Write an enzyme that holds these catalytic residues in place. Structure first.
Site, PDB file in Angstrom:
ATOM      1  N   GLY A 194       2.602   6.912   8.687  1.00  0.00           N
ATOM      2  CA  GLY A 194       4.042   7.027   8.465  1.00  0.00           C
ATOM      3  C   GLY A 194       4.838   5.836   8.984  1.00  0.00           C
ATOM      4  O   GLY A 194       5.961   5.599   8.538  1.00  0.00           O
ATOM      5  N   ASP A 247      -0.706  -7.248   2.274  1.00  0.00           N
ATOM      6  CA  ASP A 247      -0.017  -5.963   2.308  1.00  0.00           C
ATOM      7  C   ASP A 247       1.466  -6.164   2.590  1.00  0.00           C
ATOM      8  O   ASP A 247       1.936  -6.040   3.735  1.00  0.00           O
ATOM      9  CB  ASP A 247      -0.654  -5.044   3.349  1.00  0.00           C
ATOM     10  CG  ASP A 247      -0.386  -3.577   3.080  1.00  0.00           C
ATOM     11  OD1 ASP A 247       0.138  -3.240   1.995  1.00  0.00           O
ATOM     12  OD2 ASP A 247      -0.716  -2.758   3.961  1.00  0.00           O
ATOM     13  N   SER A 279       3.832   2.734   8.572  1.00  0.00           N
ATOM     14  CA  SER A 279       3.519   1.608   7.675  1.00  0.00           C
ATOM     15  C   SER A 279       4.748   1.049   6.972  1.00  0.00           C
ATOM     16  O   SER A 279       5.663   1.791   6.627  1.00  0.00           O
ATOM     17  CB  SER A 279       2.473   2.013   6.640  1.00  0.00           C
ATOM     18  OG  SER A 279       1.194   2.143   7.232  1.00  0.00           O
ATOM     19  N   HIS A 317       0.808  -1.240   0.000  1.00  0.00           N
ATOM     20  CA  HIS A 317       0.000   0.000   0.000  1.00  0.00           C
ATOM     21  C   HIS A 317       0.837   1.285   0.000  1.00  0.00           C
ATOM     22  O   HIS A 317       0.364   2.344  -0.432  1.00  0.00           O
ATOM     23  CB  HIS A 317      -1.017   0.012   1.150  1.00  0.00           C
ATOM     24  CG  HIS A 317      -0.478   0.539   2.445  1.00  0.00           C
ATOM     25  ND1 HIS A 317      -0.188  -0.276   3.517  1.00  0.00           N
ATOM     26  CD2 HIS A 317      -0.187   1.800   2.843  1.00  0.00           C
ATOM     27  CE1 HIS A 317       0.264   0.456   4.517  1.00  0.00           C
ATOM     28  NE2 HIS A 317       0.273   1.720   4.135  1.00  0.00           N
TER      29      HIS A 317
END
Lengths: 246, 15
Positions: free
Chosen positions: A195, A96, A197, A46
């Site tokens: 941020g 993800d 992630s 993502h």
């Protein structure tokens, strides 16, 4: 990172800082990542899905600060940006997980040092039991309402939540799958945030430091009944294995 | 806080 404490790269030497170069010359922070081998950084799809072009990206290792150089750091171009074919998102981001093959302008991968080291992947379907304390690291927001990211790297401790607990309607309902991991603070006072992630969820699994999770999604940050959701790495080993030969 | 301030929507065009 909501709450927790400030730190340096020596306390998470596999942490990768991923930036994107804009059309115009300006460089902005995208996401964190984890060095799993000298030429391979693992992150979240993502972070890249909207701008999947490898040339836009810059990867740093051994970096403790956001907008200034850390002594001993290394800068990398992205030789290959590999995103998971079965990625989908609703609120929940499915599959993800991403891989960035790193190469310096000199054509070199990561050189291990005091500030740069790799993180071990977990054994397949082998995760710590619920209630285990794990650490998370990132340059992400310190408050949900913040406009700016912190300049100094941060880390905190969250506890693993059972699929059964996270499954509850008043938690995440059907959004969370068996390929995801929920983790939170008992008081909801500390968490990962925007941020963070792509960054590491690291647990001590039978003696060794292990990349158990990748920061993926959540509803707000440090919110009651809304844990952080992490990609369950031990469920993606075959995917990691094949693609790390690309 | 809207979805563009959450984990999951970093580096997104709509944001």
């Amino acid at each position: 990172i909501i709450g927790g404490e400030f730190t340096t790269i020596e306390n998470q030497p596999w942490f990768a800082a991923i930036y994107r170069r804009h059309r115009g010359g300006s460089v902005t922070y995208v996401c964190g990542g984890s060095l799993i081998s000298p030429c391979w950084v693992i992150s979240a799809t993502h972070c890249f899905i909207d701008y999947p072009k490898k040339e836009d990206y810059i990867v740093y290792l051994g970096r403790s600060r956001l907008n200034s150089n850390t002594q001993g750091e290394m800068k990398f171009e992205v030789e290959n940006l590999i995103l998971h074919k079965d990625y989908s998102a609703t609120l929940a981001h499915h599959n993800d997980i991403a891989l960035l093959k790193i190469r310096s302008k000199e054509g070199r991968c990561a050189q291990p040092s005091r500030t740069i080291q790799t993180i071990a992947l977990p054994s397949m379907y082998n995760d710590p039991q619920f209630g285990t304390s794990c650490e998370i690291t990132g340059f992400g927001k310190e408050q949900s309402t913040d406009y700016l990211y912190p300049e100094q790297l941060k880390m905190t401790v969250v506890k693993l939540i059972s699929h059964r607990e996270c499954q509850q309607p008043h938690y995440y309902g059907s959004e969370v799958t068996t390929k995801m991991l929920c983790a939170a603070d008992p008081q909801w006072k500390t968490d990962s945030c925007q941020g963070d992630s792509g960054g590491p969820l690291v647990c001590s699994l039978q003696g060794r430091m292990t990349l158990t999770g990748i920061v993926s999604w959540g509803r707000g940050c440090a919110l009651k009944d809304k844990p952080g959701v992490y990609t369950r790495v031990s469920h993606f080993l075959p995917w990691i294995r094949s693609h790390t030969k690309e | 806080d809207g979805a563009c301030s959450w984990r999951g929507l970093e580096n997104h065009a709509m944001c």
